[PDB]
Amino acid sequence: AGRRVNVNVGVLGHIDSGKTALARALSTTASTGFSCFSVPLPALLQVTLVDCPGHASLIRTIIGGAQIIDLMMLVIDVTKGMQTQSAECLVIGQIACQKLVVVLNKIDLLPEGKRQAAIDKMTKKMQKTLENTKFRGAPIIPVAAKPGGPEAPQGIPELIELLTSQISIPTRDPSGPFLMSVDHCTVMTGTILSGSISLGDSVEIPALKVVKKVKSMQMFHMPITSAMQGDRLGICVTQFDPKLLERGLVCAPESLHTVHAALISVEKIPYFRGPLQTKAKFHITVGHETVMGRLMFFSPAPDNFDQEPILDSFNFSQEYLFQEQYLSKHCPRQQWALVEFEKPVTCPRLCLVIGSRLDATCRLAFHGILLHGLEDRNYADSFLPRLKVYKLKHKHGLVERAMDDYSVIGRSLFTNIQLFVGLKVHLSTGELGIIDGKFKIHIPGLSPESKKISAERSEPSQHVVLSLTFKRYVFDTHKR
Ligand SMILES: Nc1nc2c(ncn2[C@@H]2O[C@H](COP(=O)(O)OP(=O)(O)O)[C@@H](O)[C@H]2O)c(=O)[nH]1
């Protein structure tokens, strides 16, 4: 559409930072649910200022929205500094967007004498701070929006000049499945996260359990036949109860799925102090819903330990090595983790999973994509034992006698020995043998060395080694 191009802007900050306050300060001074403003573009143009009541909401609102977040603005109170939340908000941002702008709000609490040179204190700190972040170059704008406080605008048009500058470069695809994030509610006003629309289309409301029809839609001047991704319009629909859903998920019917467990693609956050231990609970926020699952990790094999990153699929045919801790720091190019939730969460496919750090350093740990969402409540009795997690369990024994040239004796294995008979075994010398208390080994081909070496020579290390493959869920196994 030649007129009215839209881009979403994530407004980030602390619970008392002035985020919600800077919107109105921008919208109001536009050219004279969510707020926004307009302006020409020398490639109209409107930018909805994403916001929310608090944090948790503003997070869950930015994760599943990532694919539509075009740029992140960072609000800061030029007195408190860079408060707690103002830090988490800065990484999640790094995950979703690709650029950001940092503004110093409340630029009225500084005395004129010590302000311009106290401003630079943070401008320096922020700059240096961002040096270790993909938002490494983010410009900074000192600005005071409500110069008095609650009851009682500074350099706002300036903040608009910048906002548009980095607001360049967008791309949107309508081919996906429909997804709209409701922020107003019978009418429904939200933002389109995935897919395309058209009058007469069918829409689902998983919160209410039903599919309604799009009687009409209206955004700014009424015309509307179809919307694309990133747009922000309102879907007029059946006079259902506009109360049960004042902010929720709407999409194509049968488009979402309810998941009891999922195979994410894992990736620790650098700034995460600590390890990533299999079986370590977490606070997972998947798409737009935060459910507490558990983890498990696993990795590829050494042969293709550096295979390309397949970030959209899953090559379920090949096997995978079990890992007790995320290998951080030759290494792997990426790894995964069979999440297992407590509550039947329910959300998109390939949705941007994130979740970490439950406890009584930063609180965020990793982030990943959802490459597969198990839907059966019995993912253990159905899909699970079929998986191929290689659990390399080793053993070692010591060789002693030499019955013949095709026989030896061993004694180890901390046993049963009637359930392992036949497994391919290898002596400390290099020859191969087939395990045929006590022991009974065979050998096709003994070697020349061990043949020379009761017994004789004092057995300078007749060592016996074993290596068998243990798929995590099958009953017992082989190797090769
Ligand atoms: N002193 C002062 N306070 C400001 C100024 N601008 C905004 N605020 C404060 O911003 C607070 C609201 O924060 P807000 O971002 O709406 O919180 P949220 O809506 O929970 O994110 C109000 O209580 C104001 O006191 C300002 O210019 N000077």
Residue numbers in the entry: 2 to 33, 52 to 62, 85 to 193, 199 to 231, 239 to 382, 405 to 435, 441 to 494, 498 to 519, ...
Paper excerpt:
Instead, the cotranslational insertion of Sec into a nascent selenoprotein is promoted by a specialized elongation factor, eEFSec in eukaryotes and SelB in prokaryotes. eEFSec is a translational GTPase that binds Sec-tRNASec with high affinity and stringent specificity, and plays a pivotal role during decoding by delivering Sec-tRNASec to the site of translation in response to a particular in-frame UGA codon. Human eEFSec adopts a chalice-like structure composed of four domains: the N-terminal D1 (residues 1–215), D2 (residues 224–304), D3 (residues 310–455), and the C-terminal D4 (residues 477–575).
The asymmetric unit in each crystal form contained either a head-to-head (eEFSec:GDPCP, eEFSec:GDPNP) or a head-to-tail dimer (eEFSec:GDP). Even more unexpected was the finding that the GTP-to-GDP exchange induces ∼26° swing of the C-terminal domain D4 away from the predicted tRNA-binding site, which results in >15 Å translation of the entire domain. D1 and D2 ratchet slightly in the opposite directions: D1 moves towards the ventral side (that is, the tRNA-binding face) of the molecule, while D2 rotates the other way. The domain movements, which are most noticeable when the molecule is viewed from the side, cause the GTPase site to relax and the Sec-binding pocket to constrict. The binding of GDP to eEFSec causes disorder in switch 1 and slight repositioning of switch 2 further away from the nucleotide, which yields a more open conformation of the GTPase site in the GDP-bound state. In particular, a segment of switch 1 that harbours Thr48 is ordered in the GTP-bound state as it provides the lid over the pocket accommodating the γ-phosphate. By contrast, this segment is disordered in the GDP complex. As a result, Asp92 and His96 point away from the GTPase site and are not properly oriented for Mg2+ coordination and GTP binding, respectively.
